[PDB]
Amino acid sequence: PCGSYCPSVCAPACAPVCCYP
Secondary structure: OOOOOOOOOOOOOOOHHHHOO
């Protein structure tokens, strides 16, 4: 999972499209 940078329901990339809307 991410910790802080992304929603880790999108895991396990923690991805710039799930992170930054």
